Symmetry: D2
Subunit: 233 residues, 4 copies
């Protein structure tokens, strides 16, 4: 089994697995049952920006999603991620649709990890994605579209979202998330994303996740499990 | 009166103003009486590195000081700094000696502030300081030495620390610490510093601080008040 | 007299002072008479992005302006800027209108200077400008508009460009452009800009410039002299 | 055959393959026969810092090596690297010893590539290397030592350099060096390195190189060919 820490922009309330009754930004530590969620007013067809921030000192994982109108949801959770994740991880984004659907279009994604000036660093930014993103590991239905967008989940050539889709994109390089001689490890990610749904109910969301390097889509992870967990423990 | 948030590497226990009975890393919000301290084992004549991290989402200000031997003290405090500081601040380092003394030598200092990709950013790094640091505002006894070091407090040409010294160095540019249309503001600072003392009691420490732009050394701030406060309320 | 190095996005051919017969991107060293220009197809009312790159090793100053349609002009000039500029400079943007006019709207501007890991660094980014940009020194008619844009030159509240306008914006902090113990100094700037003109002839352009710290708008610099020179030597 | 662009810190004059009669910093485009070299005064057992800078606009590849005493060699060569390298490359460091030997110890290495703010970016920094650098692809004799150093070539446990060694370290992620919709691509690398030799003749040097993603050590590349070419055409 994989080790996952994720920030989930969960668009669809699967009450049977813990979701509150609304679209929510969630922090998931090792289970889809978010440790802490916050109500997220999903704005259909509008570009959101998610920032995820953490440092080893503060031991607080935070996520804020905003929409250009200045609306945001935020979630923070105290967690010491060195205690959680292996040292090397890959970082990535996940999406699923299920019975309900949405585009899970990533417009841009940037990530910075620092292991501290005898600091190590990884930083990447995609403001554009290409037909053949060699530094991204595309899993499941993830593809880059004609528009330099990352479609984490299947969209018909007419960009109608498809259901029962799971996709992920991990950065090609493993990331050294916390070393035992490390004083401080911090990371921050940002991606902007377009969730549009013909459905008045979008499903299921997009995560940014940190996983064990080897992580692949868990069979069973479609839909509400956001391509991250093989079940909802 | 100035508005100060500071991370104090306080080398000298002034019990009468709240210090615990030891050298301590402290988070000071608007008073020298640290909101949260942590024991710091002061390693004389050894270079320390302090990192200070904060983001508006997590609302947690963290500081970790380490010495090359892998020894560290850390302090975190939940504070929402937008609630505290004006929007524009200057950032800086402070030191004082008092009756007891130490070199308050800054070897390097880097700082990053981000107001979030429609992000604004300021970043600076001094791994070296020059005779005439035009992007630093030197206050009090702060000078740059023949060694490209920032001596926040007076050192005789033989580098014997002097007592009753206060100095500061603020970066020349004001920093836009939190804007009201801002979704996320984060900053992180790092400086390395050489506290050496002939005295078996060093005094008084070095801070990294965030202040109102106009901040000058408060008369009365020498010694235990680390060039930051005009009294110990 | 000031010392100026500038990359000029010159929209108006003032043949009497050297301009080629077209809108041109120019590299100006110490005179408005560009050392090297390249034809620039000015795209009215379309956002351009200018990048300016230099490092002390290569001793080549390059500028590329592009428009979202993938059209670009580029200009490079071999120059050793340490030989030219003082050590400390301020960096900035300039615009003028003259008899002919245009909006000289800066949407964003980022700048990085490095004096090299015993590297020093300044980096700033404005993706937004505010009513009171405390880290920008606004000169002449430069103001920030209701839209978080930098209007280097006067625009009526209806955003009609005005003529005979000069404005500049320098970053508040001096920049240490080349030190004598320095091995490598590099800088890169990027700004995006909206030149729109009711006129079928826009005038006069926008520069990014490096100047002596103290630089103010030279009396006489309006119009074709882009707020940079007091004459056209 | 691989495609290589390299900056070679060549410590040993192999006159039969073009080297000038001295240790030299060289720019190698697609052959070990440097397009442009500059005399390098090899300082035994002293840490050097190499910076390599390039941008697509200037089309000038520059390298400067310095030693803490302020001594440097520099080499620049006009080359348009998009014309040369595929779009995706891996970046790396190479070293060899041959009959003559040296430690080819990398202390730190940082790299930045930008494909331009709709900029893409990769940045990494190793100020330390670990026993199991998962984001580095170690080839040949490259290992990380007990000291967090990258020993590109074999060193006995007593750190005596061995002869006939070749090693490389490529960053795990492919790098998107130039895209056809790209306006500007720039990269800069920096690494610091300790060449120490018991021999009064060190051999053979260290390169920073850009290669086709798939690049492995070319059989035949030991010694003077710096692990980069299968012959000296
Ligand atoms: O995409 C939204 C949800 O669709 C499915 O769950 C259902 C939501 N409403 C339903 C109604 C009937 C049936 Br059968 C199902 Cl599975 C569902 C499942 O695929 C869930 O994983 C997913 O979260
Ligand atoms: O530098 C250490 C301390 O020196 C002075 O305080 C004293 C510490 N021990 C003392 C003993 C006698 C007297 Br008088 C004084 Cl002020 C002190 C004061 O300057 C304090 O501000 C400072 O923290
Ligand atoms: O803004 C475009 C140009 O306007 C003026 O120059 C003229 C261009 N065409 C003209 C026609 C008549 C007169 Br008078 C003038 Cl000054 C001009 C001057 O203000 C120039 O500085 C400026 O470059
Ligand atoms: O390491 C320095 C050089 O050693 C060898 O070349 C020689 C330099 N001096 C020699 C003397 C005799 C013989 Br045989 C050889 Cl191969 C050499 C070869 O391995 C060269 O590749 C290498 O550059
Ligand atoms: Ca859900
Ligand atoms: Ca004290
Ligand atoms: Ca002109
Ligand atoms: Ca050689
Ligand atoms: Mn959920
Ligand atoms: Mn204290
Ligand atoms: Mn011109
Ligand atoms: Mn050579």
């Amino acid at each position: 089994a994989d080790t996952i820490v994720a920030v989930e922009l969960d668009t669809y309330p699967n009450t049977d697995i813990g979701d509150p009754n609304y679209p929510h930004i969630g922090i998931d530590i090792k289970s889809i049952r978010s440790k802490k969620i916050a109500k997220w007013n999903m704005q259909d067809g509008k570009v959101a920006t998610a920032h995820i921030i953490y440092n080893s000192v503060g031991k607080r994982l935070s996520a804020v999603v905003s929409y250009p109108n200045a609306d945001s949801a935020t979630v923070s959770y105290d967690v010491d991620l060195d205690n959680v994740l292996p040292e090397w991880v890959r970082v990535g984004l996940s999406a699923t649709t299920g019975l309900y659907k949405e585009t899970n279009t990533i417009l841009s994604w940037s990530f910075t990890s620092k292991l501290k000036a005898e600091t190590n660093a990884l930083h990447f930014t995609f403001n554009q994605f290409t037909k053949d993103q060699k530094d991204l590991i595309l899993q499941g239905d993830a593809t880059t579209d004609s528009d330099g967008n990352l479609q984490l989940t299947r969209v018909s050539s007419d960009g109608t979202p498809q259901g029962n889709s799971v996709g992920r994109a991990l950065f090609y390089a493993p990331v050294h998330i916390w070393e035992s001689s490390a004083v401080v490890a911090s990371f921050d990610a940002t991606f902007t994303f377009l969730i549009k749904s013909p459905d008045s109910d979008p499903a299921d969301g997009i995560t940014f996740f940190i996983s064990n390097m080897d992580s692949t889509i868990p069979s069973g992870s479609g839909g509400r499990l956001l391509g991250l967990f093989p079940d909802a423990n």
